């Protein structure tokens, strides 16, 4: 869903065709959820699914997410962001340093099946890059 | 007397059985009651302050001692107001005054002591016995405008047992003749147990529960009030159906008799298994036939009186009816085959079901009224020789089984009518609102302490609705008012889940109603200035589909978690100190980035609640309706404090009872004395009499004014006030036999009605002259007298030494110019300033210093909830031992005492 | 002051004698009910020897009247109390004192 949303945000024809389809067919996105861009089904579905990706990402990865969002604003490609994160594996959030991170990590580790995670830097980079790309494009869509 | 005082005091709590007895005209309740308390363990000094332990009676409406602060130095229990009357072993307690009382071997309540309390509502009087020996003292002539219940007040370090007779505690001493065991007062739809009184908080499984006001019965709830059915005349067309319905009801009666096993015999007896009346309706004896007939006529007359119209619809319907078949076995020694008329072809509208319920209510209430007139009363245990019945209570209080029995018995008659075809049109029902208290006062508001207000960030908390009634939950500003409905003004954004609504400066539809156990997650995002509500982890949406409940919120001073619970409601507020305790934080809010409100707090968040104890507060300088002017003293007038109604005679004008007092008291001396127009210097310098006056302005009705004094413990915000509502009680101490040694009257309001000084001829028309009422108090003798327009009045009062009295005026405004406190003097009589201020004790010149001002009675005020509460264990010890109450762990608070207000 | 009113009974047999040390726990209030002193606040019983004039006259007589293990209320007039001078800053001039005294033991 995030990849489809990224395609929609990147392609200018995509948005216009979606707009035309909705207006012509009189689709009631408000009825579907219970016209304006906030009612676009692509964005609505991506927003509804975003918590799943955020839950995939661990609390210590928030600063890496900010860095990846900055790079995406710099317009580097997905593989370039992947390389950037792979090199800056450090700069991860410090639980001892911050006091919200302590209870955030407690909650993160409480759930079962989340113990065998973050052991693979490639996995960390993949999830960080995906969530950061989705978040950056969502931010651009939300406020131009 | 000037600096605020501090001291460590014990927390005190009260426990009662759910037994309520009262007196009213036509009430079904017995008048004399008896109970006992046995003391098993008392630690005289568990802490530095002596252990508190008192037993007695209290009035349902008015006795509400909250934990912590209160009258005097706190620790309020039985007898610390004028709604309760307690005995502690050595003293009789009432109105926060301890009066020594003599008994053989008198001592403070100790282990193995038995206190017997007897209440006689006819006098009325309350008497005590200690270990069987009479206590030479009684309360009497107290108010009877509520229900009385047994009560024990105590601090930590006690173990006692209520003995209520019967299976709920065996009395160690015989009740005095005519007094009834208190276990007989338990209502039909309740089970005897011990409970706290007016609690706003209780312990729960997951955590403490917040509790709204309890719905309390009134002494008038025991007066049956049926609709008169004698003036109604029975139309002949209904007379035709009267006998037929009687016959059908008799057939139903006979079939029920065969089901029970009743059979026929010349005389009636249950064990003998026989019945004289089992014969056919025509064969039934003429008196019983006419009795069934008049009950039938009463059914139709009640129908008419309730007001629904009866109209003949179809004669073919009448002719189509037939009697059901019954076998030879149902045939019984009489010889007549019971022939109940079939009614399966007819059904009931829900409106007519409500009608049958109302008919059963009226029938039962008429029966109860007749029984009360005969002299019967209610009792959980039936006693025919004593005229005590378990059912002799109003229908509303009757239990479900009896209600269903009567309702079915009458629904059979309605079935007969409808089957015969008579259409019955239930009357239109016009709702009536009792509006006993204002809505903001009624709902209890709990909020976080002001210091926790958040001005930035994203915050989350949870509120579980244990009940499903009226409750609101959301975010409030620090200056939230306690007497306004949550969200009625701009100071709160809340969600009401009884009927999905969002409240801020009014109501709008939002969300959906909640079920019992549903959790509402409240989120505030101060970066986006939005408020969001979730129900069981699902975001609630408006009609337009917006996710946010409120938008464009100004930070201002900040925001605080807040909830409000209506009467009978229970909630559970989870601010998130233990993040794992939150139930839906992970599903919604955690990923969104919201933080639990109390996540990084090492201590639980302190809360405040809207206490409904009226208190006197200075009149605000910007009150919309009331204005007070300080008038300087001229050559011909003394200093004055004048009240005017700003918005009189206009739209949105507020006209309601107003209770005013002056901010400072006069104190009577410790010891009373044994046994033109210039002032005389020696007399004025040696006098102990002080004077003040009240001018009721022309156009203000004197009949709507009361002038006099109040004590520090006046708290009645009575919207329909009169001198009969004033609290009063007489404490009488006597010898071992009669010989009344001392009769002392106690009250908190000493006033004269302004209507006593209006001439009968002057009555009925507005007067054009002011009315001046003067109050004189002799601080050295305790005597209070009044004058009207310079003429001495008959009313007079006597008070005890050290009494504190505030000048007071209760008025219902009827004019823009209402009343004026005049701080003047009289010949050879000192002004109020001389009594109030030490430096002016010898100054005869009237003064009104800035400290002296007018204060009005406000119904609700914010009060801090204690962080810890006394742990009281209540349990039924046994059939003979009674109901045990135990409190062992000490709890203390640091109290701050305002000397002049004695609180 | 001095008048003695029992609150809880003692043994009824043993009474302080001259030269004996009485150990007590007391709380002092003014006639109007304002507390001004208490040994229970300090958590230490107060000891005094009868006949040494270490305490006010009202105390000297009331505790002598009391019995071991007894709790009592002593109402002491001004003359038996600090009297006209009073206790500057604590007790006003010409103040009647009310004490809640428990006689714990004799030694």
Swiss-Prot record, chain B:
**Which positions does the entry assign to sequence repeats?**
213-326, 327-440
Q: Where in the cell is it found?
A: Sarcoplasmic reticulum membrane
Specify where the region named Interaction with FKBP1A lies, as residue ranges.
41-52
* Coiled-coil region list: none
The tissues where this chain's protein is expressed are given as: Detected in muscle and myotubes (at protein level). Ubiquitous. Detected in diaphragm, skeletal muscle, esophagus, spleen, submaxillary gland, adrenal gland, cerebellum, brain and in testis germ cells.
Task: Give the phenotype of cells or organisms lacking this gene.
Answer: Perinatal lethality, due to severe defects in skeletal muscle development. Neonates do not breathe and do not move. Mutant mice show defects in muscle fiber development. Their muscles do not show a contractile response to electrical stimulation. In addition, mice display abnormal curvature of the spine, thin limbs, and an abnormal rib cage.
Q: Which residue range or ranges hold the B30.2/SPRY domain? A: 1-169, 385-580, 676-828
How is this chain modified after translation?
A: Channel activity is modulated by phosphorylation. Activated by reversible S-nitrosylation. Repeated very high-level exercise increases S-nitrosylation.
Query: Domain comment, in the record's words?
Result: The calcium release channel activity resides in the C-terminal region while the remaining part of the protein constitutes the 'foot' structure spanning the junctional gap between the sarcoplasmic reticulum (SR) and the T-tubule. Pore opening is mediated via the cytoplasmic calcium-binding domains that mediate a small rotation of the channel-forming transmembrane regions that then leads to channel opening.
Family named by the database record: Belongs to the ryanodine receptor (TC 1.A.3.1) family. RYR1 subfamily.
Q: How does it assemble?
A: Homotetramer. Can also form heterotetramers with RYR2. Identified in a complex composed of RYR1, PDE4D, PKA, FKBP1A and protein phosphatase 1 (PP1). Repeated very high-level exercise decreases interaction with PDE4D and protein phosphatase 1 (PP1). Interacts with CALM; CALM with bound calcium inhibits the RYR1 channel activity. Interacts with S100A1. Interacts with FKBP1A; this stabilizes the closed conformation of the channel. Interacts with CACNA1S; interaction with CACNA1S is important for activation of the RYR1 channel. Interacts with CACNB1.
As for what it does, the entry says:
Cytosolic calcium-activated calcium channel that mediates the release of Ca(2+) from the sarcoplasmic reticulum into the cytosol and thereby plays a key role in triggering muscle contraction following depolarization of T-tubules. Repeated very high-level exercise increases the open probability of the channel and leads to Ca(2+) leaking into the cytoplasm. Can also mediate the release of Ca(2+) from intracellular stores in neurons, and may thereby promote prolonged Ca(2+) signaling in the brain. Required for normal embryonic development of muscle fibers and skeletal muscle.
For this entry, the protein name equals Ryanodine receptor 1
**Which organism is the protein's source?**
Mus musculus (Mouse)
State which gene encodes it: Ryr1
Q: Which residues of the full protein are shown?
A: 631 to 1647 of 5035
From Swiss-Prot, chain C:
Q: Which domain of life is it from?
A: Eukaryota
Gene Ontology cellular-component terms for this entry are: cytoplasmic side of membrane; cytosol; membrane; ryanodine receptor complex; sarcoplasmic reticulum; sarcoplasmic reticulum membrane; synapse
Keywords, ordered alphabetically = Acetylation, Cytoplasm, Isomerase, Membrane, Rotamase, Sarcoplasmic reticulum
> Record keywords: DNA-binding included?
no
GO MF terms held by the record: FK506 binding; identical protein binding; peptidyl-prolyl cis-trans isomerase activity; transmembrane transporter binding
Instruction: Give every PPIase FKBP-type domain span.
Output: 19-107
Per the record, membrane topology reads: Peripheral membrane protein
Q: What is its EC number?
A: 5.2.1.8
- Name positions with the PTM N6-succinyllysine: 52
Which Gene3D superfamilies does the protein's record reference? 3.10.50.40
InterPro entries recorded:
FKBP-type_PPIase (IPR050689), PPIase_dom_sf (IPR046357), PPIase_FKBP_dom (IPR001179)
Q: How is its activity regulated?
A: Inhibited by both FK506 and rapamycin.
Q: Function, please? A: Keeps in an inactive conformation TGFBR1, the TGF-beta type I serine/threonine kinase receptor, preventing TGF-beta receptor activation in absence of ligand. Recruits SMAD7 to ACVR1B which prevents the association of SMAD2 and SMAD3 with the activin receptor complex, thereby blocking the activin signal. May modulate the RYR1 calcium channel activity. PPIases accelerate the folding of proteins. It catalyzes the cis-trans isomerization of proline imidic peptide bonds in oligopeptides.
Q: What family is this protein classified in?
A: Belongs to the FKBP-type PPIase family. FKBP1 subfamily.
Record note on quaternary structure: Interacts with TGFBR1; prevents TGFBR1 phosphorylation by TGFBR2 and stabilizes it in the inactive conformation. Interacts with ACVR1B and SMAD7. Identified in a complex composed of RYR1, PDE4D, PKA, FKBP1A and protein phosphatase 1 (PP1). Interacts directly with RYR2 and RYR3. Interacts directly with RYR1. Interacts with GLMN; rapamycin and FK506 abolish the interaction with GLMN in a dose dependent manner.
**Protein name as catalogued:** Peptidyl-prolyl cis-trans isomerase FKBP1A
């Amino acid at each position: 869903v995030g990849e489809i949303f990224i395609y929609w945000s990147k392609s200018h024809n995509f948005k216009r065709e979606e707009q035309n389809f909705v207006v012509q067919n009189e689709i009631n996105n408000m009825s579907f959820l219970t016209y304006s861009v906030q009612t676009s089904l692509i964005v609505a579905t991506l927003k509804k699914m975003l918590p799943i990706g955020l839950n995939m990402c661990a609390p210590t990865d928030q600063d890496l997410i900010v860095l990846a969002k900055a790079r995406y604003a710099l317009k580097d490609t997905d593989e370039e962001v992947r390389e950037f994160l792979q090199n800056n594996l450090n700069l991860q959030g410090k639980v001892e340093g911050s006091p919200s991170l302590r209870w955030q990590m407690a909650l993160y580790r409480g759930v079962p099946g989340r113990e065998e995670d973050a052991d693979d830097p490639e996995k960390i980079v993949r999830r960080v890059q995906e969530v950061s790309a989705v978040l950056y494009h969502l931010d651009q869509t939300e406020h131009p | 007397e000037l600096l605020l005082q501090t001291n460590l005091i014990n927390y005190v709590t009260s426990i009662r059985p759910n037994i309520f007895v009262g007196r009213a005209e036509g009430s079904t309740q017995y008048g004399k009651w008896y109970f006992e308390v046995m003391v098993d363990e008392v630690a005289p000094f568990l802490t530095a302050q002596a252990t508190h332990l008192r037993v007695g009676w209290a009035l349902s409406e008015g006795y509400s001692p909250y934990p912590g602060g209160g009258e005097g130095w706190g620790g309020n229990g039985v007898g610390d107001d004028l709604y309760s009357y307690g005995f502690d072993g050595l003293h009789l307690w009432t109105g926060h005054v301890a009066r020594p009382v003599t008994s053989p071997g008198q001592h403070l309540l100790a282990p193995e002591d038995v206190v017997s309390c007897c209440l006689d509502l006819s006098v009325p009087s309350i008497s005590f016995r200690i270990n069987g020996c009479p206590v030479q003292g009684v309360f009497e002539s107290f108010n009877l405008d509520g229900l009385f219940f047994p009560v024990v007040s105590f601090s930590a370090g006690i173990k006692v047992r209520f003995l209520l007779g019967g299976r709920h505690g065996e009395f160690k001493f015989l009740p005095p003749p005519g007094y009834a065991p208190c276990h007989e007062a338990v209502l039909p739809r309740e089970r005897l147990h011990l409970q706290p009184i007016k609690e706003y908080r209780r312990e729960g499984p997951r955590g403490p529960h917040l509790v709204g006001p309890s719905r309390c019965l009134s002494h008038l709830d025991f007066v049956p009030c049926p609709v008169d059915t004698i003036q109604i005349v029975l139309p002949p067309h209904l007379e035709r159906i009267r006998e037929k319905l009687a016959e059908n009801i008799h057939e139903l009666w006979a079939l029920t008799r065969i089901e029970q096993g009743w059979t026929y015999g010349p005389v009636r007896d249950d064990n003998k298994r026989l019945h004289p009346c089992l014969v056919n309706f025509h064969s039934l004896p003429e008196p019983e036939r006419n009795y069934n007939l008049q009950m039938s006529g009463e059914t139709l007359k009640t129908l008419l009186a309730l007001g629904c119209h009866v109209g003949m619809a179809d004669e073919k319907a009448e002719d189509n009816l037939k009697k059901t078949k019954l076998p030879k076995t149902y045939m019984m020694s009489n010889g007549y085959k019971p022939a109940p008329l079939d009614l399966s072809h007819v059904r009931l509208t829900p409106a007519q079901t409500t009608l049958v319920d109302r008919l059963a209510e009226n029938g039962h209430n008429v029966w109860a009224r007749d029984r009360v007139a005969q002299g019967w009363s209610y009792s959980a245990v039936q006693d025919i020789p004593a005229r005590r019945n378990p059912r002799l209570v109003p229908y509303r209080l009757l239990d479900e089984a009896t209600k269903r029995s009567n309702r079915d018995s009458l629904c059979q008659a309605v079935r007969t009518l409808l089957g015969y075809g008579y259409n019955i049109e239930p009357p239109d029902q016009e709702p009536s609102q009792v509006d006993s208290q204002s809505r903001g006062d009624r709902a209890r508001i709990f909020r976080a302490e002001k210091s926790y207000a958040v001005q930035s960030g994203r915050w989350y908390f949870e509120f579980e609705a244990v009940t499903t009634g009226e409750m609101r939950v959301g975010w409030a500003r620090p200056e939230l008012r306690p007497d306004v409905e949550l969200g009625a003004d701009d100071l709160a954004y809340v969600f009401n889940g009884h009927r999905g609504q969002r409240w801020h400066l009014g109501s709008e539809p939002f969300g959906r109603p909640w079920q019992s156990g549903d959790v509402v997650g409240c989120m505030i995002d101060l970066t986006e200035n939005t408020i969001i509500f979730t129900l069981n982890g699902e975001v609630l949406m408006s009609d337009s589909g917006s996710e946010t409940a409120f938008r464009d919120i100004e930070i201002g001073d900040g925001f605080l978690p807040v909830c409000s619970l209506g009467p009978g409601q229970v909630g559970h507020l989870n601010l998130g100190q233990d993040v794992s305790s939150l139930r839906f934080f992970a599903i919604c809010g955690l990923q969104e980035g919201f933080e639990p409100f109390a996540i990084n707090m090492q201590r639980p968040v302190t809360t405040w609640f809207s206490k409904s104890l009226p208190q006197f507060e200075p009149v605000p300088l910007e009150h919309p309706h009331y204005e007070v002017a300080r008038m300087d003293g001229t050559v011909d007038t003394p200093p004055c404090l004048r009240l005017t109604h700003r918005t009189w005679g206009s739209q949105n004008s507020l006209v309601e009872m107003l209770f005013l007092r002056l901010s400072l008291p006069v104190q009577f001396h410790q010891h009373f004395r044994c046994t033109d127009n210039r002032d005389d210097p020696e007399i004025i310098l040696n006098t102990t009499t002080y004077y003040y006056s009240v001018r009721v302005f022309a156009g203000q009705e004197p009949s709507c004014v009361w002038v006099g004094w109040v004590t520090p413990d006046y708290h009645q915000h009575d919207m329909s006030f009169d001198l009969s509502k004033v609290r009063a009680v007489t404490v009488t101490m006597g010898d071992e036999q009669g010989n009344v040694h001392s009769s002392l009257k106690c009250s908190n309001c000493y006033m004269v009605w302004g209507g006593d000084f209006v001439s009968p001829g002057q009555q009925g028309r507005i007067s054009h002259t002011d009315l001046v009422i003067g109050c004189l108090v002799d601080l050295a003798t305790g005597l209070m007298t009044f004058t009207a327009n310079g003429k001495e009045s008959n009313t007079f009062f006597q008070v005890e030494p050290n009494t504190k009295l505030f000048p007071a005026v209760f008025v219902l405004p009827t004019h823009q110019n209402v009343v004026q406190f005049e701080l003047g003097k009289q010949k050879n009589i000192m002004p109020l300033s001389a009594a109030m201020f030490l430096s002016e004790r010898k100054n005869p010149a009237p003064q009104c210093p800035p400290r002296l001002e007018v204060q009005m009675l406000m119904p609700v005020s914010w009060s801090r909830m204690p962080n810890h509460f006394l742990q009281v264990d209540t349990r039924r010890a046994g059939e003979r031992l009674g109901w045990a109450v135990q409190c062992q762990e000490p709890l203390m608070m640091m109290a701050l005492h305002i000397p002049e207000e004695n609180r | 002051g001095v008048q003695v009113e029992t609150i809880s009974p003692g043994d009824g047999r043993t009474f302080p004698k001259r030269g004996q040390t009485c150990v007590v726990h007391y709380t002092g209030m003014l006639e109007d009910g304002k507390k001004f002193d208490s040994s229970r606040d300090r958590n230490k019983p107060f000891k005094f020897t009868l006949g040494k004039q270490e305490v006010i006259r009202g105390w000297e007589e009331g505790v002598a009247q009391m019995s071991v293990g007894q709790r009592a209320k002593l109402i002491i007039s001004s003359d038996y109390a600090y009297g006209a001078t009073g206790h500057p800053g604590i007790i006003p001039p010409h103040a009647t004192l009310v004490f809640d005294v428990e006689l714990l033991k004799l030694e």
